[PDB]
UniProtKB/Swiss-Prot annotation:
Protein's name in the database: Rubredoxin
Temperature dependence: Extremely thermostable, being unaffected after incubation for 24 hours at 95 degrees Celsius.
Leader sequence segment: none
A biological process from GO: alkane catabolic process
Cofactor notes: Binds 1 Fe(3+) ion per subunit.
Alphabetical list of NCBIfam families matching this protein: RubredRD
UniProt KW Cell inner membrane keyword: no
Location of the Rubredoxin-like domain: 2-52
GO terms, molecular function: electron transfer activity; iron ion binding
Cofactor(s) essential for the protein: Fe(3+)
Main function: Rubredoxin is a small nonheme, iron protein lacking acid-labile sulfide. Its single Fe, chelated to 4 Cys, functions as an electron acceptor and may also stabilize the conformation of the molecule.
Length: 54
């Protein structure tokens, strides 16, 4: 499981945590989030996220 940052607002999408309040179970990989899922803080699309890895 990995972490991805919203380049706009700094929210971390943690795969371990998911986003249950917006229909995403803990353990959902970023690639598997629906194409229309957005950052729960700022509304940015998936395109605005970057994986926190080298
Ligand atoms: Fe954001």
């Amino acid at each position: 499981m990995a972490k991805w940052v919203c380049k706009i607002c700094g929210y971390i999408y943690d795969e371990d945590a998911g986003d249950p309040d917006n229909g995403i179970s803990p353990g959902t990989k970023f690639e598997e989030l629906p194409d229309d899922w957005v950052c729960p803080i700022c509304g940015a699309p998936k395109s605005e996220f970057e994986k926190l890895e080298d």
